[PDB]
Amino acid sequence: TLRAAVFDLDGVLALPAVFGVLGRTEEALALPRGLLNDAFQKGGPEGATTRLMKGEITLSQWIPLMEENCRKCSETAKVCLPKNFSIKEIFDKAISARKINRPMLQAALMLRKKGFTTAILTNTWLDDRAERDGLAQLMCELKMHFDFLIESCQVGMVKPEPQIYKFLLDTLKASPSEVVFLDDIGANLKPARDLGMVTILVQDTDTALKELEKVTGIQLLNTPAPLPTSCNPSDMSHGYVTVKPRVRLHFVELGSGPAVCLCHGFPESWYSWRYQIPALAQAGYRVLAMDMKGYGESSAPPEIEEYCMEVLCKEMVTFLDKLGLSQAVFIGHDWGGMLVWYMALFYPERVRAVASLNTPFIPANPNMSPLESIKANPVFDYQLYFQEPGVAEAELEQNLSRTFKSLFRASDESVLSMHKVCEAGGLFVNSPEEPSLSRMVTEEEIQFYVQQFKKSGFRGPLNWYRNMERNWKWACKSLGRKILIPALMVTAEKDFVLVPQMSQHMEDWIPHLKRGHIEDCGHWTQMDKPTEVNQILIKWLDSDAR
Amino acid sequence: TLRAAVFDLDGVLALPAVFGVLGRTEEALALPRGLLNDAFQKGGPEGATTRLMKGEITLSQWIPLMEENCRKCSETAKVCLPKNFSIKEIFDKAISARKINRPMLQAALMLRKKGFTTAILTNTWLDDRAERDGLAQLMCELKMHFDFLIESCQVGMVKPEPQIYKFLLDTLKASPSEVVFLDDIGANLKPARDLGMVTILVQDTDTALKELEKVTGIQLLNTPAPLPTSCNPSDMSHGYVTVKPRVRLHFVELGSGPAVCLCHGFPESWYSWRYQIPALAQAGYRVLAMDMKGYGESSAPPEIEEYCMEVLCKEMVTFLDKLGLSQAVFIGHDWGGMLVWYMALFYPERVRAVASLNTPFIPANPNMSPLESIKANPVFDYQLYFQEPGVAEAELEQNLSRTFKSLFRASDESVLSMHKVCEAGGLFVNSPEEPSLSRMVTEEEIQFYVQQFKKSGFRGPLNWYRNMERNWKWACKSLGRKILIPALMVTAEKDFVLVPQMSQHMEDWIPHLKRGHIEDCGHWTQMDKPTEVNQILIKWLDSDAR
Numbered sequence A, B: 001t002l003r004a005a006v007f008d009l010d011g012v013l014a015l016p017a018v019f020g021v022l023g024r025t026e027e028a029l030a031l032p033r034g035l036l037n038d039a040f041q042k043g044g045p046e047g048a049t050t051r052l053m054k055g056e057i058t059l060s061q062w063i064p065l066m067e068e069n070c071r072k073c074s075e076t077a078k079v080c081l082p083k084n085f086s087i088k089e090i091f092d093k094a095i096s097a098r099k100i101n102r103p104m105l106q107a108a109l110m111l112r113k114k115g116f117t118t119a120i121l122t123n124t125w126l127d128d129r130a131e132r133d134g135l136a137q138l139m140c141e142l143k144m145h146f147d148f149l150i151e152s153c154q155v156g157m158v159k160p161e162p163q164i165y166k167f168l169l170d171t172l173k174a175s176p177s178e179v180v181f182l183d184d185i186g187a188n189l190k191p192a193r194d195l196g197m198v199t200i201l202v203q204d205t206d207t208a209l210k211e212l213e214k215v216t217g218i219q220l221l222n223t224p225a226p227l228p229t230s231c232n233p234s235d236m237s238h239g240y241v242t243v244k245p246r247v248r249l250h251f252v253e254l255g256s257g258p259a260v261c262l263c264h265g266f267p268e269s270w271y272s273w274r275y276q277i278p279a280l281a282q283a284g285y286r287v288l289a290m291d292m293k294g295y296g297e298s299s300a301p302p303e304i305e306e307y308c309m310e311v312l313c314k315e316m317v318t319f320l321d322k323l324g325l326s327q328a329v330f331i332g333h334d335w336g337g338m339l340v341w342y343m344a345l346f347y348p349e350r351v352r353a354v355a356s357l358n359t360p361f362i363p364a365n366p367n368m369s370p371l372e373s374i375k376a377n378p379v380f381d382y383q384l385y386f387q388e389p390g391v392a393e394a395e396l397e398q399n400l401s402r403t404f405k406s407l408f409r410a411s412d413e414s415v416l417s418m419h420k421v422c423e424a425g426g427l428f429v430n431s432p433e434e435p436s437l438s439r440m441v442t443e444e445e446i447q448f449y450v451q452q453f454k455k456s457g458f459r460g461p462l463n464w465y466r467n468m469e470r471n472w473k474w475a476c477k478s479l480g481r482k483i484l485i486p487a488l489m490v491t492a493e494k495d496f497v498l499v500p501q502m503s504q505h506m507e508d509w510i511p512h513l514k515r516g517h518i519e520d521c522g523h524w525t526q527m528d529k530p531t532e533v534n535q536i537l538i539k540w541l542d543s544d545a546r
């Protein structure tokens, strides 16, 4: 019975296989077949290449030795290599052209999800090239999906020496018969077999995967579209900034590049962005996923006025100041979407670009009380239920598990009326005591929100809805302004509270506004439609926010 | 008696004054004197400009209104503005050319150091230009040196309206007679005077500063070269990454741009880089100042082997992995300098560039025990004293204040022999019980190190010296490699343990090595010579590490 799967990198997890480049070069250059290859394998286990693969020497030290091996192979072949022939130029292109074999990685991900221990076993080098970052990025992306990364140059052993195989088994804490080994070089496969390991000679991916499926009894080919990579809270970098005495803000941080500040809604967490954080960091951004004030590890002061838009926005400016960030892209959802439009209106200098999911930009009506305005819409009755300090806290803090399971559901899973909530006397008066688990979330993900909300509860979060009058007076000062910085409005077809239609007049105040629309998407946009959210955000980021 | 100083931005804290650009444009373009200016001030407190300054409108909305005011001023003047005349192009250059008036900022810094409350009072706008970041960066740099930043567009009032002045006094919690006010516009000075505030009409900086010195009784002109900006621990962003079960690494993070990872020595803190962090972030870098393993808020496991170079380097690679960083520039000092050379040797893919202060790169002697090697040098006797578990911990943990005050001293302040330490039976056997405070440090800075070392003490830090044999065996695997990535070696003339001379053969293993040398610098390089360290690092960073 298998419980571990090992993958080679070149020709297995990454394609096109860098080594099939020596043959491609020979042909393009009309060189005697195998000339370049002979120079690469020259001296076998004594050669420059074996020294490189064992980590005795770096790639930059190896390049002159390989080109030297190239003169000698020519001497004995009778043809003379050109004057612009560069080993470096050839390998630079080969490394650069090699990308992750996505279906192979998905198969490895699926096996690991089923309780398999996974690893990468590769003959690689210590890359000190000026262009080494491209491969460092690839290895970074690949490795975090595996239990182990065994690199020849770091262990001082190479495939096919039998010692690396005994090393592999020891690392795995498993006997050979519990291991599948995939490689594109039959010579490297043989020792794994001699030990009783299941092996797969990898040529075309589909066939290798057909073989893999058969031997594991796990479906790997033709499976449904997987979810984007999520976040494990304990594997993240956690950041803490004191924005004022007794007000500290917590954030999760991932990646490098332009700062993208993600602002969640009610009643959420930095964790609501779990499917966006790895994807946005991978797309070349420095992600800062906040626990907004009143939430999770961020401070939660009791006073209502601590949660008015003016105070919240000023604290987000200080956050940027203390981190030494002159700007950040601000991406919000629900209450975070509202904050994000106000950051653009009041601090355009600090906002590189602004994007909102579900939350439209509606300019304050100076001739109408914001309370009258809320009453005009039956779908906002829940906001009136939230007005009285203590009432919604009591219901929401009553049973945390029920609260999140009741709220976090897809559009075709609704359990909450949300209309005539005041008259019903609560949000959960029609709701089961033990709601079923929505297909959107795991039991574990619910438990994370439960644990977060045990610290401060619902007072601070609910206080965001308790500053209507103050926010309205502040917003009225911006009635003559327009939003002229890059902006994106993303609507969710099935959000029955923040309906797409409510966003229709936005072009009047944001003339250059760009849009996104997600069909069959409820209110919890990020977890309902992660793939679509990621595609829309990344595309908008690359085109409008460097 | 004064206790508060207020500065205007344009023409006072920032030069050349953006508004003296309308006159410069008129001349260069041979336009009737004051034509452009009339268009800027048009309608006075009713005009487009006053609306802009009060925050009713953004700069992008204002530009067409100002150019419109330009057609009208021409109608009545008889000349016709060109076809490539751009209000935007003019203001873009003016904003861009305006820089901090460094001597004015130094004067404000000196006053604040003397217990003054300082503030910036400015008539500014809400900048939504595509080029708004340049000014956002300037305001960011400037503001962190002041107690308050009062911007007209954010308060909805402007100079010279008397309400902003009453607002200023209220913000300051001070009566007018306790306030000096500096402005380059006499009209804005008058109301401050009418209230009894001391005023200074600012033309040339030197004279304004001569006036400021007279009225405060504090020397501001011709003062010694100030120290670079330091760090206040509670104003920093604190980061935490679990690199393995029960091993967490703490870091302080400042700025945006390429990741620069600062690695302190023995027995230090992230705080040893206090003078580098603001300077490097200001130079366009994302600084990650570590608490190395065994130190401060980082985990400190008791086992010796937890501190061998191989384990430490692997944990720094995981740190990068968990933060989503494919690379970082690694800058080390003392033990951190040693780690940093080993990161370059073993993980060149993860090291963008490598720099060391005082610590040279010495390749392991495969024909000699590292213990024999240490014994060959009388200056390394302290390392032998550190070998026995418990002995150095007892002496060092005995009185924390004495420990740091004894260690942290300039070269001409030495109190410690450091030679024949074993035979003397300690580091502090000749040292006073109550050492004087070195000119390098304040009592407060000592107390910070004392507080940090109360958590874990000296076991983990001392364990860095307890892996000679393991480090030697690991290092021997790199004997065939060279360091071919960008590298900087900084020597300290008066470091009597890590003498500049010990670095003389480095070019043999790092052929492209760049150098820095600091005269009259002891072992504690960063606090001994902050200005020189910063100049050397920034210059090397901008030229060799993007």
Ligand SMILES: CCSc1cccc(-c2ccc(C(N)=O)s2)c1
Pocket (backbone or CB within 6 Å): A266, A267, A382, A406, A407, A408, A409, A413, A414, A415, A416, A417, A418, A495, A496, A497, A498, A523
């Ligand atoms: C009150 C939490 S914010 C909000 C806004 C719009 C729709 C929703 C829904 C939450 C839960 C729903 C359900 N029935 O499961 S609909 C929540």
Ligand SMILES: CCSc1cccc(-c2ccc(C(N)=O)s2)c1
Pocket (backbone or CB within 6 Å): B266, B267, B382, B406, B407, B408, B409, B413, B414, B415, B416, B417, B418, B495, B496, B497, B498, B523
């Ligand atoms: C033992 C701490 S590491 C080190 C290396 C080289 C010189 C120094 C000095 C520390 C303190 C000195 C003194 N006498 O104040 S010299 C420390």
